[PDB]
A paper describes a structure:
The dynamic properties of microtubules (MTs) are a crucial facet of their contribution to cell function. αβ-tubulin heterodimers polymerize head to tail to form polar protofilaments (PFs), while lateral inter-PF contacts complete the hollow MT wall. GTP-bound αβ-tubulin stimulates MT nucleation and growth, while polymerization stimulates GTP hydrolysis in β-tubulin, producing MTs that are intrinsically unstable. To illuminate the structural–dynamical aspects of EB binding to MTs, we have studied MTs polymerized in vitro from purified native tubulin from S. pombe (Sp_tub) together with the S. pombe EB protein Mal3 using cryo-EM. Our data reveal that MTs built from S. pombe tubulin have a different architecture to those built from mammalian brain tubulin, and that coassembly with the respective EB family binding partners serves to focus both systems toward a common 13_3 B-lattice structure with slightly tilted PFs and a single A-lattice seam.
Author numbering:
A (entry chain J), B (entry chain A): 1 to 428
C (entry chain D): 1 to 121
D (entry chain E), E (entry chain F): 1 to 38, 49 to 444
Amino acid sequence: MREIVHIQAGQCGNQVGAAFWSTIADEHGLDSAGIYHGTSEAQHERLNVYFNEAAGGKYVPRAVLVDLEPGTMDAVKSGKFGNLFRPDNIIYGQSGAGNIWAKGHYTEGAELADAVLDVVRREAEACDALQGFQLTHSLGGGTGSGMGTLLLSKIREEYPDRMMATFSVAPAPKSSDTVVEPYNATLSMHQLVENSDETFCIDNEALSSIFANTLKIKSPSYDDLNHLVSAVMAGVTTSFRFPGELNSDLRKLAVNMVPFPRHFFMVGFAPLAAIGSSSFQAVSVPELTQQMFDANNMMVAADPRHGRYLTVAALFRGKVSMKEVDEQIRSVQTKNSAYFVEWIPDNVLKAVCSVPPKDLKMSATFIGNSTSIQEIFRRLGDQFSAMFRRKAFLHWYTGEGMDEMEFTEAESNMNDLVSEYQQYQEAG
Amino acid sequence: MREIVHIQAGQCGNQVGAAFWSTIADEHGLDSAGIYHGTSEAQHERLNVYFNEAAGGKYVPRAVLVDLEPGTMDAVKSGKFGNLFRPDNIIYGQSGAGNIWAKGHYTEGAELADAVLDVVRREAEACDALQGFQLTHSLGGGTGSGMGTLLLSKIREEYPDRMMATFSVAPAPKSSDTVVEPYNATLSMHQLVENSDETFCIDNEALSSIFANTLKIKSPSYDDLNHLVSAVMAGVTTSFRFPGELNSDLRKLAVNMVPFPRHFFMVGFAPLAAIGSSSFQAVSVPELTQQMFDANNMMVAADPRHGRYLTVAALFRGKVSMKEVDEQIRSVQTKNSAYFVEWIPDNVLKAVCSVPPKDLKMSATFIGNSTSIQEIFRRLGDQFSAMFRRKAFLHWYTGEGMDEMEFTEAESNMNDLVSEYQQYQEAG
Amino acid sequence: MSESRQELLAWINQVTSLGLTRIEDCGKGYAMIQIFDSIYQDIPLKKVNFECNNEYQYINNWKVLQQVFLKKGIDKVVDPERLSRCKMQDNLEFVQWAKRFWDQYYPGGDYDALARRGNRG
Amino acid sequence: MREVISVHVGQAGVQIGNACWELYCLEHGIGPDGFPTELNDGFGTFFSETGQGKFVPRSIYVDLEPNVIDQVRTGPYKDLFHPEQMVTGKEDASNNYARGHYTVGKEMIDSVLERIRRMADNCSGLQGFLVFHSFGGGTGSGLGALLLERLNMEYGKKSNLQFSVYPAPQVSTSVVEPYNSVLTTHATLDNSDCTFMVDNEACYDICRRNLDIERPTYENLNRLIAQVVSSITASLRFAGSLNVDLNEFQTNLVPYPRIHFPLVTYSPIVSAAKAFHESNSVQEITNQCFEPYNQMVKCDPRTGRYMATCLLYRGDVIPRDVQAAVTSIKSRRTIQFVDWCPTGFKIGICYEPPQHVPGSGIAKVNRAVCMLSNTTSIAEAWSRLDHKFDLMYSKRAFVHWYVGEGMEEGEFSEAREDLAALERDYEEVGQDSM
Amino acid sequence: MREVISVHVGQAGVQIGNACWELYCLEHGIGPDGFPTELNDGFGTFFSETGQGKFVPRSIYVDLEPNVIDQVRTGPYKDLFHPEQMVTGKEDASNNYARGHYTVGKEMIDSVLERIRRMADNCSGLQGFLVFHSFGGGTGSGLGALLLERLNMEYGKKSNLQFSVYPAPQVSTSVVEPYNSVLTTHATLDNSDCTFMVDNEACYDICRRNLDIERPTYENLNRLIAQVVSSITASLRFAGSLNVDLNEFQTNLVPYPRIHFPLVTYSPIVSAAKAFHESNSVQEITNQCFEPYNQMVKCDPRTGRYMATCLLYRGDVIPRDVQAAVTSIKSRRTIQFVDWCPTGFKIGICYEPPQHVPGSGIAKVNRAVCMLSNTTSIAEAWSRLDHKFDLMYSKRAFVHWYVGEGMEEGEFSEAREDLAALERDYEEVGQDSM
Ligand SMILES: Nc1nc2c(ncn2[C@@H]2O[C@H](COP(=O)(O)OP(=O)(O)OP(=O)(O)O)[C@@H](O)[C@H]2O)c(=O)[nH]1
Ligand SMILES: Nc1nc2c(ncn2[C@@H]2O[C@H](COP(=O)(O)OP(=O)(O)OP(=O)(O)O)[C@@H](O)[C@H]2O)c(=O)[nH]1
Ligand SMILES: Nc1nc2c(ncn2[C@@H]2O[C@H](COP(=O)(O)OP(=O)(O)O)[C@@H](O)[C@H]2O)c(=O)[nH]1
Ligand SMILES: Nc1nc2c(ncn2[C@@H]2O[C@H](COP(=O)(O)OP(=O)(O)O)[C@@H](O)[C@H]2O)c(=O)[nH]1
């Protein structure tokens, strides 16, 4: 019944579970205890996606929370929601990853990979029909950046028809975590592009701009940060997980987007407001569409005004027509006609879902494609290569088992990406 | 009425009684005092198997607990359940066995064999119709390994139609008891193969893996160890001892298994979980079947992935269909088709029993055959022969009455077994 | 300084002449003991088994080196139990370490252990 | 369970731990008798517990005097340790490297190396081990350099951190501090993974201004170094926000295997009346941690350019006030450049508030910062030594009392030579072109 | 009822039992007057009870002095024995084998052999009998070797265990310990089924470190040997988990009828303050029982390879912590090989907790280990004797006082010869090839 098995990796790659799973329970009317409490009968017919049925209504979240160090793993165990996940799927090593890629990709995950795949296999064939797999991790760290990629390439070597879809979070332009965060980003992209289809890129610093610019809070914390970018994992399945009028799926959101095997694009929300900014509007699709236009409601630290929109899919939920979107999309595609790609007339995808979220009459989820995602990788590439000139921190990788020229290959892998996005910025 | 008289031998060969007999009473609704307390009327029509009827409802367990030293014999006497067995069948010598085989097989049991057979004869002809005899003992020790075998060969020389079925426990690959445990194992197999039909092999170390790997207890004791492997003695008679839909018997479980007179195969349970791992599942036949696949739910310290399945019998109890097993056995026989033996298409035996056990909605008992039970005996044989090169500890056997070349014969007896399992590993 | 998998695998394919697909067969071995016979020449090859994919049985084959390290005296502890897992985190820095032994002790000549063990018979 | 053990050699290494473990016992609710308690994993972090409930501080003590060690069993921690772990020496010839190394200190080693062994036989999750000594010591410089060179010979890949203390630019404690200190950076060069060093006269300089006490003592300097320890170690012993492992430092501080001498900067260190009439926000602290007033080592980190620096924050911290602060440091002229890392930071967040010991005059605070700064200037105290040490060796002053204890002067011939490559290494990193 | 009797010859054999039976009376709730009690079979194990409720310790005492024996009737156990069993000798010429064997000690034998007889006339389940003597004794070495050779001549197949004690590598108690000790291993070679021997100077070496008492005595050494006795005997007198018989040892320690000299290793032996600040788990003990610090016999069992070793555990023991420990010993380099048994162990479990006598400075523990280790090294104290004894015989020193008591030197001609085959036997087992 078109279902997904969930995979996390890394510390903050595991932190996103609670913003995900407590929402998707609340989106499906489900408590902390797992037992059922839902209002409408609308929220059942596609409930089977992110949940395996249980004895006595428990409705276990199909997930495997994976990490290399037991620091933050007990935190969601010993905290609340300690009875949602089944601890057979909680696995974690003890020795530190040191957030070094090949330590996390090549060798210490290989201590734990043998326990990984026997977990997800018996999860896979107990499902009816897999729709796909989700990988949420980091680009910057080591555990999520390294171990999930080796974890990915085995799964893509087992299920070549099944779709592989990934979420990940970006290195920052300014607010970076560590100094090998250039190396981890390049090495992560070497496996994402080759194995999985689609990956999205979320700057924490641009996420920090959101509550700064839009919601006006001087001091949010990460439990507000993941709480916001949670709902796009809700939003991509919003179309899917309960009925509507039109909606399609992530594989149908895969083939429509890109004319090539080269899949990266953007994320945004609609609507969005502050505390006191709530009631002073008229929340509607013209209110929705303009928070689906700015870079300020995006996640990528790159300018669509520097870029060009390849393809757009829009995912609405609530009482919403088409012509309220039609007349409004036409109102903004005309003034911004040079912002579209002339390879495709009408690269707009419309999808209308039924029920609203909590306390909001409408909601929309943004998917727009760009040429300026190279503005990440050009900002990455010279951030990468300048730390290769003196072979910066090289012995913490070649002192673990990887040839240095294998690291040089991923540069051209990044440059193979940019070489295409060099063209469709200005060609045709 | 198709009934069994029970025989134990050795210290831990007598320890298994309490895990057996308190369960089979509880499986038949029967107290410590022997007098009847049962809920359903379902548990009577085949109650006569492991019990001789008594005056005043006492329902004596038909058993003879046999040992050479009075250390552990009083322990179940002076402990609880001291009024189940009748003390006429409690026999035990006083002088130590020293756990040396021919001391226990050939000579000190011959002090007690004359009292043995006059016990089991009057037990035999007081039964209606014997279904068979159970021998539970050790391979490693002396009393259970030696005295029961001489005890066996007299019974097989008295009742050639009656089936002889034995349970025994293996030498360990790593966690061995004594150093003559190689000699006792070889000498025990010289009588098991020649006289009785079937014997099963249970590693304590692989049993120690079960609570380690599956149930997650750092420190179980033997009263948890025998408590687990008890229920397969319940499980082999689960089909038999109260009604169902289809079930067959151990003689019908004998002729179906092996195409030769060479009878050894494996043991496992289903389901199985930890303390907190209980309610987080959906206990069913797909939950049952996958704990009927791994080596981790087996007992033998040998790889079925190194081996090949000759024949399989499955013994379910609970509300269970066939197609829930059919579609599921077909789901695993296809992915693991090279794991089966191509001499026989569909070597699967299905048997469905009715009532569930205590606090579990379903239960299954594993019987699967292997080629890699030679992985015991090859691990035994070079463990055997290397302690023959210098005639290791030889005077504690030839100083008791057995010729040394008689000990050499059992090597080829082991090698006669392996010579066949050499073939059907890769032939045909 | 250190060596990756890329050079070292054909490097250990060289001096042993073995069909070593992945390094985790040194999780069993068969090559680490074939490092030392390229110097010391006294190692009794008939003391190890050859097929032996049976980890509970394999533990005999780790200790055969503990006579070799005895008679020549290199004080590194060998903990075979995670070594025998055919898993990494110990086997690399056991063979990164045995090519720290590559430094001075070669006489340069070849040592055909492919011909010495009876053509692995 | 991600556990690590701390050795204590040298009379400095004695009294340093007497502040470190005091902080350790207060940072878990441990009664001073060992029998505690007048997080979940936290209650068994540095401590191999017995079922009695008291527990052993996983440490060791190494000294060749019975003098200062037996003060502990006189002192109030008489039940904390155990009298196997606390190995003394009956006699001593300290300020004498090459008999504390080569004659008298070596007789303790086989007794020492056994006690390293069994404490490594319970700590299943082992993260290397921690080393305390001094340069102003003889034997702590002496046995300490000998202590690493067999342990890293044994333990191979395991982590080797040490917090050292070197003789000041202005005030010595002994004349041998050219001699029997500057050679010990030989053995600790290729046996210490990373290392850290600090000045008394710089730490005293903080005491007259930021602590404002005219006559401090060692103990107050001991308490100040000790929180830097728990800022690194116990941060992974507490469930923070962005956790920082011990292994992360040694891969986020060295581009090259030699260059492992960062700074220490700890802040806020604020006196009693100074905390009042003052709000110390997080950027109020980080603007102090680049100013030389809270600087631990009497050097010129202003003049040199910074290389790479990890930061550790305690208490109630947001990353937005980090990025609002740290974007102002990189803008400001008071740093100019890194060439080899266009970011040059590592940020780490733990929630545990700064522990405030009652006795000393330090004041309580609700947020904390620890700073480990690599620079292009820290080799000048090394160049102070080269100005000093090459002058003593320009007279051959008790070479006999380096010879008669059993070592020729070939290592003194090697002494400035390895030092010369250290000076050569910072100008090598000082090369910043195309 | 699976019962056995313990003879006591020699002044060592006097005072050894004065710790053994003290432990025996405390391990069953026996008042010191014999009239007890201020398991089921346990209450009548070593004891042929009378209906009065007091009971005889099934022992005997053999000495040719009235000196130390009459200390018992002066001492507090004056009602324990009975004055038939306690057979003395009116005169003595000790340190003189061949009149304690052949002249003066033989006059007691017919009185002794009767008292062996009637005590064998109640013990229906007889498991051989137990022998205590010394090598440092004359007559205990003298009459003791004579004691076995008629009893094993009588009793044939019956079990013959002895706990001996031999003159140290460094400290003798008499000069005759080359002479009137090393010959007694003739008669006890082919009359003792198994045997065991222990060193004072090794047991004293434990006292200065693991007991930490500067001036111990015999009595403390007597208490330490005594628990090894009850670790073997009373383990079958208590309903354990995997019971171990007396007969199991003599078939699980010798591949060949000569090689019956194992080790003893008892652990934990832990002083008073040492038990505190310490958790001694079971693998914490077994990692000590292979280290030479708890080693009973001053030899080099590290260098030699181990042959076969049975272990006995007391108290609260799981076999999983056995197999987690014992798989680490066989991995570890500190043993290398057995060739003749690829397992080389025998594991045995009894539940009875370790008995803790009040007076001495030993500390209480909730788990115990006894170790009986056969090796390829224990013949070196025998080779110490061959270095010693062949030198005395290279001068013929009071051969007259071996002759004048009534024996020619043909046994001294045989003395090193049987010793030479013992040395030849360990290199014979030292042969490990194809
Ligand atoms: N105890 C102590 N020593 C300090 C402190 N600060 C700096 N030191 C230095 O530590 C050195 C202590 O070692 P020593 O003076 O040699 O005393 P010691 O017992 O002989 O030390 P060893 O040489 O290692 O035996 C002194 O030279 C001081 O310079 C401190 O706060 N406490
Ligand atoms: N009584 C006693 N003797 C010990 C003890 N430990 C060692 N010994 C030795 O036991 C020997 C005692 O026997 P003797 O010295 O000859 O005293 P004795 O009465 O003449 O003994 P016999 O020769 O058998 O008559 C001494 O040589 C000591 O070496 C102990 O703890 N108690
Ligand atoms: N999703 C998410 N990522 C974060 C947050 N805070 C920091 N990060 C990034 O997540 C990673 C945290 O590092 P870590 O999880 O330890 O890397 P790991 O080795 O893969 O576990 C770093 O790359 C941070 O830049 C957060 O709140 N949410
Ligand atoms: N069934 C069983 N066997 C055990 C257990 N513990 C040890 N064993 C084995 O059982 C035998 C115990 O020896 P023992 O019973 O005295 O041998 P016996 O001479 O035949 O009585 C040994 O071979 C042990 O390996 C247990 O808990 N259950």
